[PDB]
């Protein structure tokens, strides 16, 4: 089984890969908003990006081999457009064999103290660094990371005897899984290097990742649903699918699990240490398939029995389709939590935001926290609910034609005033949504300045009609996502670099965050096309003094906003020396006790404020849900005062 460097197999490019790359290259070179060419300069940048992708932390790199393969750093264009990805595969194989050269001595030694922490430092930003020349320095430095991890595990963690042996098993199995990577990994890595060199949002999706995107854009999982996490060659079936049809047969649970199984009558291939992707692909099946289910003692036991289970269209959904629009509280003020702009988000939200047009409306809120953009047609069909038939977004290709996309089917169904709450990690379609409401002046912008994405991508399959006929032995081919157009607001401006500046600034947003579109590589510039035609409902976007000072009073009248401002002051103080962190166990234990005491003090203050019993020890309280969001509470207060105005401002 496990041996030495000879055991590491020589990876070879797969048959279809060539063609795949070609098609990809074609698209990327011919149809992309960025007018670029696959010249020698671009090939060299691809070489450097692929090097940085092989090992981001500049750990196991070798100047000698880098310069040996930097000789052909000009030919990568011919490599891509020819399909013969020889250089990529050879470099990856050399990196795999050098993984063994990375280090050897440290393993199993997890308790015995070999090194002391005498005012040492360590870099947290290891991207900017020269290529290592010698061997001894890294061989010595490698043990430092795991030894600091185990020292912090002595600071805070589980008991030693239980987790240490499992950590050693995890390191050995990590070395094992590193030697079990397939050619698809190398192919997708090279394609991703190329795409990211072109544009930060351009990407290539492997057939597995293509199915992943299809399900992430359809929810129609094909197989058995279950969220899983692995620890040393055994995945734990959390199976939070509850109401799932394959979960109705919960004859097996978290502890009633097996490894080797078959699918719809296939030979039960005893999977022992396989990859997560491999076993999940084996667990999946088409619409109308079967699956081998084994009956075993509900806990730890070695007694297997064989029965069957059915596969069908299964739609795992972390959505809430609940429609309870009642006048409770003071007004019908609700919070809408959107996890993503799904293709079916309009088809499931129309149950929620449609049926209240003739009846009395209220100031409801739409929260776009931690949002992922899915579709643009759906974004326009969802944004047409609050705007009576109007342009939601403008799109512009590399030629210069501008098109305003708006679904010409339906008037403003929800005629109530609306508040949008958005964070900085929001989706681009969410930016389109909020920008539409801000330029129309119908809603109120509240929250954090968004990420700042302004590029529209096309997601296309790489399959021709003749692929099935004359290449039957080929597997499924990947897909591509390349920026075709650039989107703009109806006011003429764009959110590609400046984002959206909301009327209601939040405390956590006032900090200069080192995240966004600016810190992304190859991000497009900013340009403001002329303003569209649109009816603005009052110029309250630039003039929001009514609720501004009210909510400033509210944030200065509560200690939660003040404690959060203290947190952001701690951030603004630590970010000076954030890149190089010092590891002295004395001062580290000092800061750990400081943080624990500050958390206990804030918890006792909020308990005294709310009248709940005070906590004294950390053992009685299990892992539970903390406070969700005080900024949603400020948005509800904003909606309340907006209803106050609408009652006092019909004239």
Partner 1 sequence: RKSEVLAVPLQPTLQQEVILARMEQILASRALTDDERAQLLYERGVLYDSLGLRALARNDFSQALAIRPDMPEVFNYLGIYLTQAGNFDAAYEAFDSVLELDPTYNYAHLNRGIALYYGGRDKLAQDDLLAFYQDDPNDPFRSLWLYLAEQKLDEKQAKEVLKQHFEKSDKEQWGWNIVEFYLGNISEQTLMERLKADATDNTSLAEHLSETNFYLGKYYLSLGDLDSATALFKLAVANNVHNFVEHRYALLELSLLGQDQDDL
Partner 2 sequence: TSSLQASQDEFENLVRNVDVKSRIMDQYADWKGVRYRLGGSTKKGIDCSGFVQRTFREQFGLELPRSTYEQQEMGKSVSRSNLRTGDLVLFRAGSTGRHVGIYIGNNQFVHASTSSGVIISSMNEPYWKKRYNEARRVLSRS
Where does this chain bind partner 1 (CB under 8 A)?
Answer: 19, 23, 26, 29-31, 35, 37, 398-399, 464-466, 469-470
Considering CB distances under 5 to 8 angstroms, the limit depending on partner class, which of partner 2, partner 1, none binds residue 465?
partner 1
Closer CB to partner 1, 114 or 469, in the complex: 469
Closer CB to partner 1, 75 or 216, in the complex: 75
Pairing of strands 335-337, 364-368: parallel
Considering CB distances under 5 to 8 angstroms, the limit depending on partner class, which of partner 2, partner 1, none binds residue 513?
none
Closer CB to partner 2, 31 or 572, in the complex: 31
Residue 409 CB, nearest distance to partner 2 (Å)? 5
3-state helix, strand, coil in the chain (%, to 5): 40, 15, 50
Considering CB distances under 5 to 8 angstroms, the limit depending on partner class, which of partner 1, partner 2, none binds residue 409?
partner 2
What's the rounded Cα separation, in Å, for the pair 73 and 92? Answer: 15
Closer CB to partner 1, 27 or 201, in the complex: 27
What's the rounded Cα separation, in Å, for the pair 386 and 438? Answer: 12
Considering CB distances under 5 to 8 angstroms, the limit depending on partner class, which of partner 2, partner 1, none binds residue 410?
partner 2
Pairing of strands 120-123, 580-583: antiparallel
> Are 238 and 327 contacting, i.e. CB atoms less than 8 angstroms apart?
no
Considering CB distances under 5 to 8 angstroms, the limit depending on partner class, which of partner 2, partner 1, none binds residue 625?
none
Residue 437 CB, nearest distance to partner 2 (Å)? 22
Residue 410 CB, nearest distance to partner 2 (Å)? 7
Considering CB distances under 5 to 8 angstroms, the limit depending on partner class, which of partner 1, partner 2, none binds residue 31?
partner 1
Closer CB to partner 1, 29 or 218, in the complex: 29
Q: Phi-psi category of 619—alpha, beta or left, where left has phi over 0 and alpha has psi -120 to 50?
A: alpha
Radius of gyration of the chain (CA): 28
Residue 401 CB, nearest distance to partner 2 (Å)? 14
What's the rounded Cα separation, in Å, for the pair 602 and 559? Answer: 9
What's the rounded Cα separation, in Å, for the pair 639 and 437? Answer: 15
| Helix residue ranges, H only, 10-120 | 15-30, 40-54, 63-69, 76-82, 86-102
What's the rounded Cα separation, in Å, for the pair 504 and 78? Answer: 52
Considering CB distances under 5 to 8 angstroms, the limit depending on partner class, which of partner 2, partner 1, none binds residue 620?
none
| Token pair of 2 as six digits | 């496990």
Considering CB distances under 5 to 8 angstroms, the limit depending on partner class, which of partner 2, partner 1, none binds residue 473?
none
Residue 39 CB, nearest distance to partner 1 (Å)? 9
Considering CB distances under 5 to 8 angstroms, the limit depending on partner class, which of partner 2, partner 1, none binds residue 463?
none
| Token pair of 511 as six digits | 């900090």
- In DSSP notation, 321-362 reads --------SSS---EEE-SB--TTHHHHHTTTSSS-SSS---
Residue 196 CB, nearest distance to partner 1 (Å)? 22
Considering CB distances under 5 to 8 angstroms, the limit depending on partner class, which of partner 2, partner 1, none binds residue 19?
partner 1
**339-364 burial by CB neighbour count: b if 16+ within 10 A, else e?**
bbbbbbbbeebeebbeebeeeebbbb
Residue 236 backbone phi and psi in degrees, to 5: -105, 115
Total Cβ atoms within 10 A of residue 545: 9
Residue 484 CB, nearest distance to partner 1 (Å)? 9
| Residue 311, CA atoms < 13 Å, CB-side half-sphere | 21
Closer CB to partner 1, 529 or 645, in the complex: 529
| Residue 638, CA atoms < 13 Å, CB-side half-sphere | 33
Note the residues at the interface with partner 2 (CB under 8 A).
Answer: 389, 408-410
Closer CB to partner 1, 37 or 409, in the complex: 37
Residue 477 CB, nearest distance to partner 1 (Å)? 13
Closer CB to partner 2, 377 or 510, in the complex: 377
| Token pair of 14 as six digits | 């797969």
Pairing of strands 203-205, 479-488: antiparallel
Residue 408 CB, nearest distance to partner 1 (Å)? 24
Closer CB to partner 2, 405 or 567, in the complex: 405
Residue 500 CB, nearest distance to partner 2 (Å)? 30
> Are 352 and 378 contacting, i.e. CB atoms less than 8 angstroms apart?
no
Closer CB to partner 1, 402 or 553, in the complex: 402
């Amino acid at each position: 089984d496990i041996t030495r460097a000879d055991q590491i197999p020589v990876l070879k490019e797969e048959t279809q890969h060539a063609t795949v790359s070609e098609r990809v290259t074609s698209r990327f070179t011919r149809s992309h908003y960025r007018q670029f060419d696959l010249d020698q300069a671009f090939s060299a940048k691809i070489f450097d990006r692929y090097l940085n992708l092989l090992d981001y932390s500049h750990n196991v790199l070798l100047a000698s081999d880098v310069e040996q393969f930097a000789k052909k750093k000009t030919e990568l264009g011919d490599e891509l457009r020819s399909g013969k990805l020889d250089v990529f595969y050879d470099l990856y194989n050399l990196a795999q064999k050098r993984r063994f050269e990375r280090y050897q001595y440290a393993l199993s030694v997890l308790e015995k103290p070999m090194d002391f922490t005498g005012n040492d430092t360590y870099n947290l930003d290891r991207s900017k660094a020269p290529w290592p020349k010698n061997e001894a320095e890294l061989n010595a430095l490698w043990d430092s990371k795991v030894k600091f991890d185990e020292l912090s595990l002595k600071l805070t963690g589980k008991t030693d005897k239980e987790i240490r042996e499992t950590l050693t098993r995890r390191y050995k199995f990590a070395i094992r899984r590193l030697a079990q990577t397939n050619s698809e990994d190398v192919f997708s890595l090279a394609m991703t290097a190329f795409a990211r060199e072109i544009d930060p949002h351009t990407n290539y999706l492997s057939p597995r990742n293509t199915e992943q995107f299809n399900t992430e854009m359809s929810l129609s999982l094909e197989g058995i649903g279950a969220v899983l996490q692995m620890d040393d060659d055994y995945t734990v079936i959390n199976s939070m699918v509850a109401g799932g049809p394959a979960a109705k047969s919960k004859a097996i649970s978290v502890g009633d699990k097996i490894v080797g199984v078959g699918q719809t009558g296939k030979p039960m291939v005893d999977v022992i240490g396989w990859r997560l992707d491999d076993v999940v692909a084996l667990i999946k099946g088409p619409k109308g398939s079967k699956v081998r289910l084994e009956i075993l003692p509900a806990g730890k036991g070695t007694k297997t029995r064989t029965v069957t289970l059915t596969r069908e269209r299964i739609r795992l959904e972390d959505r809430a389709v609940k429609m309870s629009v009642k006048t409770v509280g003071k007004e019908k003020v609700g919070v809408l939590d959107i996890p993503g702009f799904y293709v079916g988000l309009t088809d499931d939200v129309k149950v929620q935001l449609q049926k209240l047009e003739k009846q009395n409306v209220s100031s409801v809120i739409i929260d776009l926290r931690s949002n992922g953009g899915g579709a643009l047609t759906e974004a326009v069909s969802l944004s047409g609910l609050f705007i009576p038939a109007g342009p939601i977004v403008q799109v512009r290709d590399n030629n210069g034609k501008v098109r305003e996309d708006s679904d010409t089917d339906g008037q403003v169904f929800y005629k109530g005033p609306l508040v949008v709450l958005v964070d900085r990690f929001s989706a681009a379609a969410s930016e389109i949504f909020a920008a539409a409401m801000q330029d129309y002046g119908r809603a109120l912008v509240v929250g954090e300045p968004t990420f700042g994405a302004g590029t529209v991508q096309q997601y296309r399959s790489l399959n021709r009609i003749y692929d099935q006929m004359l290449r039957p032995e080929w597997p499924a081919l990947g897909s591509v996502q390349y920026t075709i157009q650039k989107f703009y607001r109806v006011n003429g401006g764009s959110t590609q670099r400046k984002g959206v500046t909301p009327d209601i600034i939040m405390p956590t947003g006032n900090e200069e965050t080192e995240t966004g579109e600016k810190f992304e590589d190859n991000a497009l510039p900013w340009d403001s096309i002329d303003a569209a035609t649109y009816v603005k409902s009052g110029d309250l976007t630039a003039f929001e003094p009514e609720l501004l000072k009210e909510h400033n009073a509210r944030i200065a009248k509560d200690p939660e906003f003040q404690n959060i401002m203290k947190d952001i002051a701690r951030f603004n103080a630590m970010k000076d020396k954030r890149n190089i962190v010092s590891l002295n166990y004395a001062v580290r234990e000092k800061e750990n006790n400081e943080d624990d005491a500050t958390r206990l003090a804030r918890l006792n203050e909020r308990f005294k404020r709310e009248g709940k019993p005070e906590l004294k020890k950390l053992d009685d309280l299990p892992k539970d849900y903390q406070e969700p969001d005080p900024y949603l509470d400020e948005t509800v207060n904003i909606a309340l005062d907006l209803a106050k105005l609408e009652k006092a401002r019909p004239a």
